[PDB]
Structure 1
Amino acid sequence: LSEQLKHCNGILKELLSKKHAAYAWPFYKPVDASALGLHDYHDIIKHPMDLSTVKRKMENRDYRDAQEFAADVRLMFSNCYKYNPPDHDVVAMARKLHDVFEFRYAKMP
């Protein structure tokens, strides 16, 4: 519970760390749809999510358990898979960071 949330915080720190920065960077901050010219993004994605939002939520004790934390991290990846064609560069980066996430999440106490 507290212990599972510590494991989740460890995962989050790893996802934001230099080790994974070459492919994690698209997930660091909310998608700025206007700035990127993605004028359909918010018609297609109902629930935006990104790692800075997950971090704020963890810091504020929003997540009561691991499952709630994981749902947001997975939501972030699902948004990427929903919006972008499956052969897009950002999707290749998502698959790698998602693999990092799932393998360490599976080691939950």
Structure 2
Amino acid sequence: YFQGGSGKLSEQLKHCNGILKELLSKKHAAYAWPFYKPVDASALGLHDYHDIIKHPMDLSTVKRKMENRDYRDAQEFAADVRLMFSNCYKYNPPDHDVVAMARKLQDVFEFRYAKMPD
């Protein structure tokens, strides 16, 4: 209900915003879709999720934070994206399909984040 953030993004944050658009794009939808919204622990029957995962994260939350101008630098953006993957790796056994998807999405993220303009 207070004013939302707005302003130009820094050069490094434009790079991050580009990454975000790519992670949300049709290019990666086959493996990105489980990360499009918060994990709905109630609907999926994951009654231990919120006991194991203290800081839930997903791409819709990253998108709202970018649009709101919450991120002040690239490191802060990267930390949220990585948190989203870490949560998946913490909660799930390593042979789960959703873990395979997370690893693929993370390869996309890591390879492009590494090309940060200096």
CA-atom RMSD in angstroms: 0.7
Distance 1:12 1:102 in 2: 12
Report how far residue 85 of structure 1 moved: 0.1
Report how far residue 71 of structure 1 moved: 0.1
Match of 2:3 in 1: none
Distance 1:89 1:49 in 2: 18
Report how far residue 68 of structure 1 moved: 0.1
**TM-score, normalization by structure 1:** 0.99
Report how far residue 91 of structure 1 moved: 0.2
Higher-Rg member (1/2): 2
2:41 to 33, 41, 46: 33
* Deviation >6 Å, runs of 4+: none
Distance 1:44 1:16 in 2: 26
Distance 2:60 2:21 in 1: 11
Distance 1:82 1:7 in 2: 28
Identity of aligned residues (%): 99
The alignment covers a number of residue pairs equal to: 109
Report how far residue 105 of structure 1 moved: 0.1
**TM-score, normalization by structure 2:** 0.91
**Tell me, what secondary structure is at the counterpart of 2:93?**
coil
